Design a protein around this ligand. Structure first.
Ligand SMILES: OC[C@H]1O[C@H](O[C@H]2[C@H](O)[C@@H](O)[C@@H](O[C@H]3[C@H](O)[C@@H](O)[C@@H](O[C@H]4[C@H](O)[C@@H](O)[C@@H](O[C@H]5[C@H](O)[C@@H](O)[C@@H](O)O[C@@H]5CO)O[C@@H]4CO)O[C@@H]3CO)O[C@@H]2CO)[C@H](O)[C@@H](O)[C@@H]1O
Ligand SMILES: OC[C@H]1O[C@H](O[C@H]2[C@H](O)[C@@H](O)[C@@H](O[C@H]3[C@H](O)[C@@H](O)[C@@H](O[C@H]4[C@H](O)[C@@H](O)[C@@H](O[C@H]5[C@H](O)[C@@H](O)[C@@H](O)O[C@@H]5CO)O[C@@H]4CO)O[C@@H]3CO)O[C@@H]2CO)[C@H](O)[C@@H](O)[C@@H]1O
Ligand SMILES: Nc1ncnc2c1ncn2[C@@H]1O[C@H](COP(=O)(O)O)[C@@H](O)[C@H]1O
Ligand SMILES: Nc1ncnc2c1ncn2[C@@H]1O[C@H](COP(=O)(O)O)[C@@H](O)[C@H]1O
Ligand SMILES: Nc1ncnc2c1ncn2[C@@H]1O[C@H](COP(=O)(O)O)[C@@H](O)[C@H]1O
Ligand SMILES: Nc1ncnc2c1ncn2[C@@H]1O[C@H](COP(=O)(O)O)[C@@H](O)[C@H]1O
Ligand SMILES: C[C@]1(OP(=O)(O)O)O[C@H](CO)[C@@H](O)[C@H](O)[C@H]1O
Ligand SMILES: C[C@]1(OP(=O)(O)O)O[C@H](CO)[C@@H](O)[C@H](O)[C@H]1O
Ligand SMILES: *Cc1c(COP(=O)(O)O)cnc(C)c1O
Ligand SMILES: *Cc1c(COP(=O)(O)O)cnc(C)c1O
Lengths: 828, 828
């Protein structure tokens, strides 16, 4: 497969260093090495071929001094690194050969790597796809985040209920990171602010040290390897036993842990805000440690000897760009001001223009519950200087507003960064727009909406700032790595250039009429379904029918994502079957899966509904093969890599106006799945690219929702004029799915019936009719696959390479390069 | 120096892999490598030459199935590993050459290694010397202990007061250990005991997992490399979020730490008991995890297929011997019974004979405060089954006693393992004697005393059990590694066989009259003093006079060790000078140093006294060079390696009957220092070996102390008939040394005056007169060095190789081998 070359000499070196690391690094012997030990041996042999490059890329940036881009995210949803590293480094087929001559099956070894799930969902995956695309366009980019000791929890279902277990991902080691204790930085917490003479001094602070760990991010076949720097918290060795700190020496040492708890776990809220102080400590910890590392490179490169100005930050935006990934690092704006004004003693106005020109903010949601307004009482306590600075910012911001909208007192009310009233809080989004020079939404519809609805005021004050950059996916992991079959057949026809130029995929339009290509496309699909169907029973217990339509919705469980509507589709189907049982119907294996944040009662309930449905449906003998509903336990990046290649239908059903973009979207459009969806997020652009006719669009569009809201959405109307929906609601209410606890799903019936913000029932009739259109087309193999080819041929625009090329040009001001950097290494 | 060979080919391979690890393992570049990075690069290159051997020694023990010896200690005072590994592996001069051709100075690199101070003092150093000697006699020995995240604290003096800081020794990594997460074992805590039908079941327990980390222990030049296995505590991934454990998911994850706190720090009590539950948790944690690893090797070796008996432990003592190092692992006796009786279902009597024949206990102190009596209320709670077993043990033990001493009710009272009265507690020492087959003291005098005083009852019941094994020191680290000069000059004359046969040192008796040898001996001494004097000012600030008598007492600060008496010697001297200031007196640089346990008020006070004295004395202009008193900050194994080669006088002044052996002793006897000491611990045997005349023995002997105690020790008698002592006590009381806080040393004057158990003042007159004899002899260079040669020639018996050869033969039943094992490695 062209997975590259496979080459006698390299095969021989690879074998040799696999064995060098088994012995010397693992200190294991072939007589007692387990597959885990072979995985480590191989990981560490691949790692070695990337070091030369890593060291050369950073040496190279040092002397060539480019504008560096720092991407700040509190999530990086990396996934497994091995195969991806082999892909981007071209080692895949050399190693496959070598591991077979050692006798090992490489793919068994890949399954032993545990995902780095340092992320919840799409926000963190974006950052990881971004990372790959910044390396592939050779940008000097660095992604800074926290090294959580426990990442997102592992979901285990027991009784149809999510049982969350900790993700002890570092348990056996991580052969990719390189701890860098030489560069530990202190971060200060609490303190008081002494305003005396020269300025304010943040004094009496508690120190937590941030210890960096670097991971390499290899660009695809272009020899650039950039760095992902993740901080760890470490308690100071001195103050935790200094002062006249008696308490108990032994307790003093046991108390170190409290400071280290800043990097202990990722907060599992799948965008929704939580005012917890340890989260605020994380968010400040990232920013402070990172910005010291930013200032440190600025002062050392080539300004390294630029002598007699003072030291000067006029050039700081031409050498630094930092990208705020959602508001979670907005303290970079008051911390950058704190450093510049209080420490380098710049004039506030100068410092502010350098800050605005460095910062940029990406907004991910319109949903209010996810927005961060931190209580000013907490900010006062933990970070008093930053509260002062925010207050001063706000001041001057509002004075700018006053002058522009003379007399509109409510504008001042709306636009203030401080939300007055009862518990006065600080709106992080407003901070970000006030101090960034560019603000972008992630899909064009989400950016129009940001300009009309929530930030309209800021749009009117500074229209110039508002931009859009539709999200994207990296074809390497999302095509080449999870679906090499499709990438091979595509490559036979149009070559391999498309892996770093996805737009070339549209030359496949010439093959929508090619019968060999149709056979091929459908064949990779059926093979993938077979490989997944087997996974399903070999790691769990299943018997699914592989010639079903594999209908799947995998994403975080939430009510706007509307898994419930899909649930409503399933029993309508089960019941349609159940009433005229000898009617032919196209078989569907509906798989729905995703994690639910602990505590979100409703999402935990929705999960039980799906398993409840599966319990009934999957054991009704009158259904047979015809419907299988399966809930996919513990979704994460490695399950996404197995289920999206096997999927036929992609469920993307948000009430129009709630999904910002959606990136799962895009992953199924390559991989040949057909989308059923509403016009929301990026589904709009995927349908423009492939054409309305090659998409199954149903549902109300945004206006229609707003029309309904001004009328008054009343679910009772639906219930009363739709009999099928009424039978479902009755089954749910009677305990048809909960035989021994009828009472159970009344909670969900209640929200559906009475206070459902996401208007599940108004989209139901269209949903169901549109689903009959999907089965109509699945019965004609040839035209489903032609629709599929037009979808695949058209997903080029959803590559993150395009997205980063746009961020680069229209916001960071840096130009992309596909120019390969020369790196081998030394050999002397 | 013959430090071995230095050899063109090996020099070339070493350079090459130093560079392989700088690049590939450290991912650093010569352009940015710091000395720390070069230390890691070198450590990791030495490490590589030991792996072949390690793997071969364990493969070899596997098939050759010997009786394995497990040494259980809760302390292992390792020190730095690099140079020692080079010594024992013969790589020292190959690397010195290689690092010079790379341009680096090896000795700068050795100073960057941080001590593994997993120990307090002599108890833990013993274990580490034992480890080296078991490897050198090729015994299949394993040392099991805890991997503490923080070892003994680092002492920092501020104001003459000890300020203790945490020892963040793992901060930059430890290139020697090999984490072994494949072998994590659970340990159970709390629980209840359900006695039903077949036996008792320990049920409902909390699980902590013990995760092993192995370190290699290379024998000197004989290619055996044994293993030191240190456990780490890890919290279970399931129960810390299972049950219906709501609390807060995020708190659940933050609570993992509590279980991990079992391996967080070493308890800094420098033998003295502390009834703290986390200590009991450590002690049980070691034993349970270790014994599973012991049972595991027994059941797998060659009994691995010994089929149809059941599985049988009759051969367990012929294949296992575990050595209890002080009572801190005595739970191995109830845990071995718990496993055998409750889990393998053996008959209690059979299980007991296998237990007694496996176990052996080494007793280290007669001092009551150090003995562990655990409160039975704590044992009930944390370990209920083990309390039952201890009770049953006790029963049967006392019934054995009753039958042997019919009617001696008080014997039953004295000998019970359970100390009744108010807080009923369990005497660990009695447990150990009851269930071990051999019990030994560590110096012959300490064993006679154990038989007469504290365990006389147990002696009379089982005389056969009581043995002695005088402690020893390993000539490799304590001669070859800290003092290669002396080892070279010794080697020129008598060859190198003495490094694994220290008794050969006595052929040096032929050179007590050799003038070249005298010049040589004294020359290495003066050079060593110069190297230490320079250390002293380059890392601190000092100007000491190098041609002084370097009089030094370095050991843990405690009142029985009597640093106070030495303090009394110093101001007598300062005052003698001060009254007739133009008298010649032999200059002395008195260095006293050692850590004091936090909390031991008196030891913390004694430290301030010494610095107080130094403050006065060292700045009196009428003294000049004549007296320097210096307190050596932060004593540990690497400072011992620098100060004992430079020392002239070795202070070993315990009230006779309190030091068990003392091992510091021995270190100064090689290295050419002359001992001033009482007849206590092993000073008795060092004086038998070198002869009374070559030792400065003063003080009362044991009888005399016991005579005094029956009279009534009254310090006032001394005060009143000795004027010098009276002036000192007055200076202390008046605030002569504490000008601004006179009140300050009255605490120490009070204990001296009124309740001094260690009878400082009764030994004073002899002490001082004996010290005048030492200065008399230092004025005649030639005969001090001849005395020195007779001391050095005689320290052969204090090698730990002898001690382990005796443990081996008279207790473990295994024979030593100096036979080299063949190990290179593979090369194919
Ligand atoms: O040296 C400069 C300056 O420093 C000091 O000013 C600071 C204040 O002392 C300090 O309290 C803080 O002020 C905050 C204020 O606490 C916060 O609530 C917020 O004020 C906004 C309201 O939130 C906003 O609603 C609006 O109030 C209007 C509202 O627009 C209007 O629609 C209607 O509903 O009536 C409301 C009542 O007037 O505007 C105000 C601001 O005008 O923001 C404030 C500024 O961040 O921070 C100040 C800046 O450091 C000194 O006190 C001052 O004398 C000095 O000149
Ligand atoms: O199936 C066997 C057996 O099991 C059960 O016996 C157990 C007891 O129920 C249980 O309490 C526990 O007994 C302990 C006892 O608690 C503990 O205090 C200790 O008893 C010693 C005294 O400590 C010791 O001083 C001495 O008492 C004498 C003393 O020698 C003498 O000098 C003088 O001063 O008078 C004292 C008062 O008599 O001896 C006793 C023991 O004789 O040790 C006990 C044993 O460990 O553990 C028992 C064993 O499991 C059942 O209760 C019993 O009926 C069954 O036969
Ligand atoms: N002081 C310097 N002299 C030469 N090269 C340097 C220097 N400082 C940093 N570099 C190099 O540039 C790299 C990038 O480091 P950093 O600035 O920490 O990301 C290093 O690993 C070096 O190769
Ligand atoms: N008990 C709670 N803990 C955390 N989030 C909650 C809680 N109650 C409501 N929310 C949230 O508000 C949202 C809607 O949940 P619901 O209240 O069940 O409709 C989600 O984003 C939830 O996470
Ligand atoms: N199952 C086995 N078959 C062959 N060799 C073994 C086996 N089990 C243990 N050994 C070997 O003996 C060693 C010592 O292991 P251990 O018993 O854990 O100390 C291993 O590293 C192997 O080389
Ligand atoms: N406050 C205390 N904490 C710990 N050990 C103590 C304490 N008080 C007395 N001891 C001990 O009893 C011993 C003698 O100390 P002292 O009471 O100062 O004479 C030492 O081994 C001490 O560690
Ligand atoms: C917060 C969020 O994640 P999620 O898919 O988990 O809801 O960020 C992604 C990346 O910008 C978006 O594609 C997505 O619509 C949005 O909801
Ligand atoms: C407990 C102890 O340590 P220390 O030297 O720290 O007091 O064990 C050592 C080894 O058995 C003995 O030599 C020593 O006399 C004894 O006191
Ligand atoms: C692609 C991906 C997502 C994004 O899915 P959405 O439906 O856009 O939220 C989330 N989680 C994982 C594991 C993914 O790989
Ligand atoms: C040798 C040694 C000791 C032992 O000294 P004693 O006076 O016997 O207690 C203690 N600590 C260290 C650092 C040593 O190397």
């Amino acid at each position: 497969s062209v997975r590259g070359l496979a080459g006698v000499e390299n095969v021989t070196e690879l074998k040799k260093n696999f064995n060098r690391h088994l012995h010397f690094t693992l200190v294991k012997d072939r007589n007692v090495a387990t597959p885990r030990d072979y995985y480590f041996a191989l990981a560490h042999t691949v790692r070695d071929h990337l070091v030369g490059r890593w060291i050369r890329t950073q040496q190279h940036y040092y002397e060539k001094d480019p504008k560096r881009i720092y991407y700040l995210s509190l999530e990086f949803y990396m996934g497994r690194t091995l195969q991806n590293t082999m892909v981007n480094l071209a080692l895949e087929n050399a190693c496959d050969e070598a591991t077979y001559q050692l006798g090992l099956d490489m793919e068994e070894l890949e399954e032993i790597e545990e995902d780095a799930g340092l992320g919840n969902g799409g926000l963190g995956r974006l950052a990881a796809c971004f990372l790959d695309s910044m390396a592939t366009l050779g940008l000097a980019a660095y992604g800074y985040g926290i090294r959580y000791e426990f990442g997102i929890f592992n979901q285990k279902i027991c009784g149809g209920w999510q049982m969350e277990e900790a993700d002890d991902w570092l348990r056996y080691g991580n052969p990719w990171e390189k701890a860098r204790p030489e560069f530990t930085l202190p971060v200060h917490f609490y303190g008081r602010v002494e305003h005396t003479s020269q300025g304010a001094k943040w004094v009496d602070t508690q120190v937590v040290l941030a210890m960096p760990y670097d991971t390499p991010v290899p660009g695809y076949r272009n020899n650039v390897v950039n760095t992902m720097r993740l901080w760890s918290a470490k308690a100071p060795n001195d103050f935790n036993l200094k002062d006249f700190n008696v308490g108990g020496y032994i307790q003093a040492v046991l108390d170190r842990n409290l400071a280290e708890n800043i990097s202990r776990v990722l907060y599992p809220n799948d965008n929704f805000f939580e005012g917890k102080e340890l989260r605020l400590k994380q968010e400040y910890f990232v920013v402070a440690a990172t910005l010291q590392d930013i200032i440190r490179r600025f002062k050392s490169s080539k300004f390294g000897c630029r002598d007699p100005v003072r030291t000067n930050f006029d050039a700081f935006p031409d050498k630094v760009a930092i990208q705020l990934n959602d508001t979670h690092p907005s303290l970079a704006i008051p911390e950058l001001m704190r450093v510049l004004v209080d420490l380098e003693r710049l004039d506030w106005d100068k410092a502010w223009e350098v800050t605005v020109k460095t910062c940029a903010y990406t907004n991910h949601t319109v949903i209010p519950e996810a927005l961060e307004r931190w209580p000013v009482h907490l900010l006062e306590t933990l970070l008093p200087r930053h509260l002062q600075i925010i207050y001063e910012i706000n001041q001057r911001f509002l004075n700018r507003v006053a002058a522009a909208f003379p007399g509109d007192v409510d504008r001042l009310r709306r636009m203030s960064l401080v939300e007055e009233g009862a518990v006065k809080r600080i709106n992080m989004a407003h901070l970000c727009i006030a101090g960034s020079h560019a603000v972008n939404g992630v899909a064009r519809i989400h950016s129009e909406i940001l300009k009309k609805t929530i930030f309209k005021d800021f749009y009117e004050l500074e229209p110039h700032k508002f931009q859009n950059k539709t999200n994207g996916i990296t074809p390497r992991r999302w095509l080449v790595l999870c679906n090499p079959g499709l990438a091979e057949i595509i490559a036979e026809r149009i070559g391999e250039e498309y892996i770093s130029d996805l737009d070339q995929l549209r030359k496949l339009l010439s093959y929508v009429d090619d019968e060999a290509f149709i056979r091929d496309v459908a064949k990779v699909k059926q093979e993938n379904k077979l490989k997944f169907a087997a996974y399903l029973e070999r790691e769990y217990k299943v018997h699914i029918n592989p010639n079903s339509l594999f209908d799947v919705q995998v994403k975080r469980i939430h009510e706007y994502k509307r898994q419930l509507l899909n649930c409503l589709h399933v029993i309508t189907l089960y019941n349609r079957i159940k009433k005229e049982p000898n009617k032919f119907v196209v078989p569907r294996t509906v798989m729905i899966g995703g994690k639910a944040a602990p505590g979100y009662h409703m999402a935990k309930m929705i999960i039980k509904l799906i398993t409840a449905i599966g319990d009934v449906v999957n054991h009704d003998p009158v259904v047979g093969d015809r419907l299988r509903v399966i809930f996919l336990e513990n979704y994460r990046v490695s399950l996404a890599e197995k289920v999206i290649p096997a999927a036929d239908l992609s469920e993307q059903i948000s009430t129009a106006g709630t999904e910002a973009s959606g990136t799962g979207n895009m992953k199924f459009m390559l991989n040949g799945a057909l989308t059923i969806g509403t016009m929301d997020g990026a589904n709009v652009e995927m349908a423009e690219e492939a054409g309305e006719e090659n998409f199954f669009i149903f549902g109300m569009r945004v206006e229609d929702v707003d029309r309904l809201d001004q009328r008054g959405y009343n679910a009772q109307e639906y219930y009363d004029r739709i009999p099928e929906l009424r039978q479902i609601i009755e089954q749910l209410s009677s305990g048809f799915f909960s035989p021994k606890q009828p009472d159970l799903f009344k909670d969900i019936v209640n929200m559906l019936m009475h206070h459902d913000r996401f208007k599940v029932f108004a989209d139901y009739e269209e949903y169901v009719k549109c689903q009959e259109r999907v089965s109509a087309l699945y019965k004609n193999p040839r035209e489903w696959t032609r629709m599929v080819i037009r979808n695949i041929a058209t997903s080029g625009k959803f590559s993150s390479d395009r997205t980063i090329a746009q961020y680069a040009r229209e916001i960071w001001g840096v130009e992309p390069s596909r120019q390969r950097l020369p790196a081998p290494d030394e050999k002397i």
